């Protein structure tokens, strides 16, 4: 797939940060390389945000929050900006899909059909909420007017991971912007480009200077500078547990509100009365979608004893059938993992799996001559206490586990520190809702898997997170509630 002219021009120059409505270099001039994970080549050279750059972005966001058009605009004017931003992203859909394929590694056609569509729709959806963020009037006494206001919290720092780089930026920014906050946001070092391209479109849509500030760089410097900044009012992070925990401990010092979206080890449960054809397809897609680089991937596939060997046989064939290649080549179904480090991590987990006694029924090694490719992998002969069953692998790797009763699968499914999502396959109306009610996860799909939409909340129970993104629910993260009492005698 030949590069669009605007992608070629963008990549032909150093990639600048976006602060206070301007494209700028890091103050101290540092740069870093992002790669193409299919070729291992340097894809661009990007300006590297340091602490002093974050502090500049924070002042920019503070000023835009406190005075100027953003602080003065009506809600309808604010909605219109977000709507225009969505339209612009849709206009640049092929450019942005190419950058995602190039920079992240995923198939261009998927980045275009799924990731760009979702980002557009998320911004459309949240433009909608700007004029509808309502407080209460509260009837207490004839002597007072009691009302609440849902005020924006102020300057928000946001950090996102590399698996759905553009989409993830929209999960953070659509709700935050809709409330009237301003933003200092950091993309992942592996994937800065789609966001920094999208910056052009915030400027074009007419966002006032400093409303949005994009600071690409590395967790331990740019990331930690966001986490530790005294003038950031609220933090939101999606990423590592270790980083999640760190963020929470640091935010303690300022009594700062945190939203976290972390990992999972989500179960996808095939009951005796499932439509087995459709469940097999849901189980396969459930783990293999986005190369398994998906926090809510259905990495534990629980299968009723009667169907266990049927599903294993089908999963093995489908895994071997997947077409691996560069995301910018048209026949590719599954691209490489994002980095050498991730490839080595996923291959390490496969070795640990075999070491602990499990059997690789398909895959279980690297693929192709170069690039960070891993073959789709199916593990079988697996038990609940194995490392590969307990821990999030974050690649195209599924464990398949038989079970004999519904009480049992619920227990086993819930016996996890994680609780991001779950799938249940059954044609029975009672069993579907009953099993859904008892699973400890933020999202349950009945007879489907991996569905997300702007309108429906997503987040973790237990150690898969604190709080919800998407829906009306996301808005509450970026608001402070003021209770006003007017003595009316």
């Amino acid at each position: 797939i030949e590069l669009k002219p605007k992608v070629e021009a963008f990549l032909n120059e150093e990639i600048k940060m976006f602060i206070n409505g301007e494209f700028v270099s890091a103050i101290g001039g540092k740069t870093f390389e992002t790669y193409n994970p299919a070729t291992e080549d340097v894809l661009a050279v990007v300006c590297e945000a340091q602490e002093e750059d974050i502090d500049a972005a924070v002042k920019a966001a503070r000023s835009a929050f406190e005075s100027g058009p953003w602080a003065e605009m009506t809600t309808a004017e604010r909605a219109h900006l977000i709507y225009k931003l969505a339209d612009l992203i849709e206009e640049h859909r092929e450019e942005l899909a190419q950058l995602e394929a190039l920079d992240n590694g995923k198939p261009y056609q998927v980045a275009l059909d799924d990731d760009i569509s979702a980002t557009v729709e998320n911004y459309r959806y949240y433009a909608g909420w700007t004029t509808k963020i309502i407080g209460q009037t509260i009837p207490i006494s004839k002597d007072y007017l009691n009302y609440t206001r849902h005020e924006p919290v102020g300057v928000v720092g946001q950090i996102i991971p590399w698996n759905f780089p553009l989409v993830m930026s929209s999960w953070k920014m659509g709700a935050a912007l809709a409330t009237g906050c301003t933003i200092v946001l950091k993309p992942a070092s592996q994937t800065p480009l789609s966001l920094l391209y999208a910056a052009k479109l915030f400027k074009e849509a007419g966002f006032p200077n400093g409303v949005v500030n994009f600071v690409p760089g590395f967790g331990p410097e740019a990331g930690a500078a966001i986490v530790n900044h005294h003038d950031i009012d609220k933090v939101a992070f999606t990423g590592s547990t270790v980083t999640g925990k760190y963020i929470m401990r640091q935010s303690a010092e300022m009594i700062k509100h945190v939203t976290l979206e972390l990992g999972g080890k989500s179960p996808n449960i095939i009951l005796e009365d499932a439509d087995l054809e459709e469940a097999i397809n849901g189980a396969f897609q459930g783990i293999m979608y986005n190369h398994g680089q998906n926090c809510s991937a259905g990495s534990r596939v629980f299968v009723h004893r009667k169907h266990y060997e049927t599903v294993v046989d089908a999963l093995v064939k489908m895994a071997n059938n997947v077409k691996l290649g560069a995301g910018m080549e048209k026949e590719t179904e599954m691209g490489p993992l994002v980095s050498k480090k991730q490839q080595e991590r996923v291959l390490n987990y496969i070795e640990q799996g075999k070491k602990e006694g499990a059997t690789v029924a398909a895959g279980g090694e690297r693929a192709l001559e170069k690039g960070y490719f891993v073959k789709p992998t199916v593990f079988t002969d697996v038990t609940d206490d194995m490392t590969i069953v307990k821990e999030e692998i974050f690649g195209p790797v599924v464990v398949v586990l038989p079970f004999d009763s519904t009480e049992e699968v619920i227990e086993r499914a819930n016996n996890s520190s994680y609780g991001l999502a779950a799938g249940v396959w059954t044609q029975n109306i009672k069993t579907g809702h009953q099993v859904a009610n008892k699973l400890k996860a933020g999202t349950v799909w009945i007879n489907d898997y991996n569905l997300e939409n702007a309108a429906a909340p997503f987040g973790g129970y237990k150690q898969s997170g604190i709080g919800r993104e998407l829906g009306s629910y996301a808005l509450d993260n970026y608001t402070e509630v003021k209770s006003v009492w007017v003595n009316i005698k």
Copy 2:
């Protein structure tokens, strides 16, 4: 002297048991501590002291009660009725409970009765009403799915409360939690265990299932920490000091555990040029002096437009000097002692720090009476924004009075603070009142009033005064996990 109620005598005449799994019990290791009467300094009761092991027993009971048996299976109508029967019982025991508050915490009995017990009753009545009404969403996305959310109780919640409004504080924790269907492990402050441990009898009589509520009296370092660090508690909520608030957020990180915190303040109470001055003088005085200043949302910075500053200082000084200090169980008392010797010493050292930095004690500024933990109502003037006493929460009957010259100036100076719990604004102008309310960074703003709370209105801090809200519908969301269910109907 107010004579002790028969049921109060009876209660005080034996060891005060903790309440676990529906039973009154001693600590497993038999440890006990003393609570005191702060007006007299005498030992008031001997109370069973919860240790780590007793928190574990409580958590096990709450877990069991949550996962199966009547509390798990009950309809929301049946749950609501339990909570309303509890409120009715507390109301029947109102005199006994108000006496225990006056005795244990130190506040005037008639205020405990008219304010504290009344609010607790109303907070439970209000929350009983929410059980049947904690609704999720059905979400129109596509003709191919039913999309709905469930607001599920989060599970066992651990709650820690302070000593300044002991019983009311217990109700701000438990009303919302219980309405959601959570089960509870709650620790009263070691200075004020008694009203809660008495009210325990009422939960049992109301018909609460074993283990749905569990009260574990003791100390921050042991009972407190055991709640904070317990792996099987799903969610924590705390009201109290900042150091503990930070500690609790820090520790909750290890479990990715949701935290709600209600912390202290340095709340401004602002008298503008067109205030009704007589009303605003009364509201400025009551704003700080109510509950002996032991009030996180106390109006401890009184900002007074230059035209009225001398007039207001003069009045506050006279009012301060006239307040009648005495024991909470003496009928003539207007203000009781502080809760402890340590608090009295804390406040008095703040006062000394204020004099050391150049402020003037216009009234008060010393201990009171021959015994008990009393501090005189104190008014400081000649104060500047950089002074320790104007920055930090004193938590006694100590007010600073600051003049100002412009609205824009006072809004800046009111907001120049790490705290953001509450604020008051006094002006007769409809545009000024709302404009100033809007610009203040405070979780509650009163226009032409101060210190009003009601179960239906949320309360809590911006900035370092807290995370989250209590009261209102808003409190409920702390105790809920949201589950998004997608049903393929293609």
Copy 3:
């Protein structure tokens, strides 16, 4: 085995039954009275004061006063809630007395009145007590230059009229929501069944309701009912009953641009698909129509059965129908009482005769029962077609039609081919089928694998000609408020 009369019921019934206006038990101004009957025995059960247009006037003036000034107008929402809760506690204390009154006056079995009606009544008040403090409006972010807020103000004096089939429960569907908003109430019970409401007036008084907040005016539809409908100073009307009256009500309400809520009748389908759990569906189909003697607006009076199970379900329905124990509501043996009046017995027996002459076959029942009182046998009609009178029209008795079908598309179309739309049942074990069918039925309530469930928290009301508006739930509140949008210029 006769259920023994509560002493309090015997005392109530030993005197003329007064109406309740402005806090006091009073006679009609003109002293007219009427008779209510015991439909099991046909005896006079009580003599009741008959409200005339002038008694409505006095009730309306009393409600107006209580709304505009005095304790009901001044009370906090907490205070108002507490009255409503205390009323619910009093009803629960008098549960036996009230259930006997239902059984005597209405006819239904005592145990059913106690377990169902009285408990629903109590729960309805407790649920709406809970709303008083939670009737919130909005603050609306538009511009920095304005504060924009709404108030959900009580409409004022509300006129309510209720039917005889669930006398006390129906009073609480009207008053719980109206009282929660802070309205004041002029309410007329059915001439057939005045007594449980008038007994309950004691408990409003004991609970501490201010004078005039509630006013109960027993009498007939053409005098007392019409008076409430036509009264210039009633702000809003709510009615449950006959369509012809519902139409009249809507027509008269035009003249004053008055908001109307209507809950009307139905011809609700109860649909057994091929993959139904036949055990529970057959029980659901039988209780769906026979509950309350078929005197139930949302009765499942059309039972559609997939061709595969048609014979099975017809045979089982006929057996159950023939096994029902008919008798007095105050005899412990009774499973089904009489119909409420001679007029209604005659109406239902007319429909049955009409069903016979249009060609349908009575597979069970189809006639009067026992030696006295207004009893009709449980009746099952087979060999029916969709254009029959008995399949189209509401019968309001223990009369079911059974219709086979061959495809899901077909049953949805036939179920929906009705001017009514109150309720529907769908029996299928399939998770996709249950929701899809539920989505496509035009009915205010759809039960999936059940039938006849109501709860204070879940709204109820008609599509099409089964009504306007909803009762129960948070939804009922909105009928009793006017929304006021306030703009405060803040520069």
Copy 4:
């Protein structure tokens, strides 16, 4: 100086104006046409196809089919949203064309049409686009045995009738809410002002609305109007306009138990208290009435003035009245245009004559203006009492009565002593007085230190005989929704 006509406007007016049915521009089946006029010149402005009963039937069938099957029924909520936002974008792109059509057909000044009416229409659609994905029902925690959820389903085919005073804006107040719920529409504009709607139909098509989702049927009350009101296959009706028609519509809707929303007239009070900012309140009182030539249901047609200020306010209003520049809407200097028709001018002049006959003083104006066109001078009446016709009745012209008062209790009582209750204004600097007075005024919208402000997000509608129900805001959606309560047995 004349505003020069846009090319697209000339083009549109150079042919017969077709109606819009099932996605196509068509003539009336029987070929009837009617004339609309330019009320500044009294010239024929356009010839418009006239919908008859038969054309209404065709629009209803198209809407029915669009509702039951096809893209509109199948589309996601995101897809439906996007159609609505794109419509808003198109309207904005054609803002000058649409503003000219409004100036020409309705009368109002071009620049006000542009800045106010067109901006409000655009923002209305953008607001409602945003609701499509957010129309949520409830999950309701009752028992562990059931999942209880509600669906807010679109009612179906909706019949809407709008007046001539804000033609395009009024069209958006009906369709934004309705289309956001998934309903389909048969909408009739006023015969006096059909053009802007029928121009806008081109933009519904260009946005990509499926065939029959919207259908525009211009014509006359007694034929087109009545056919919408009386149609058996319209599910719900909404109307804005006269009282006599409002009452007709409610009466006719009884026959089908059809939900009705009415936005009717007012005689709204604009109260200037002793502590008002007097300069701002005089400007608010003058604009409250004279905006849109007084052709405004919520016009502040009763200016109450505290006695201290009475003379001052009278003198100011008189000066301001006599200073308004009357002229054609398409003339750049015009501050106020003519009334919409000869009949309206005659009505307003008949009112003014009644006021004189009853003893009131024409302080300014009170007669027609200019050499042709339906102009009336801005008119100020003094020496007025509460019982006069001109004080009680809605005149719908640029005519104000000015009433002195002496106490706040007095002005509230006199303000509320009306069958109308659409809107009110209160002018006071005092924070307690403002909210207190606002709490007591029986009106759907209360402005404190302002007047005539509307926004898509803030509900609007009448207390008493000013209406039933609310338009705008979240509240408007409920009128277009049937609530279904689903119970899923999960035992």
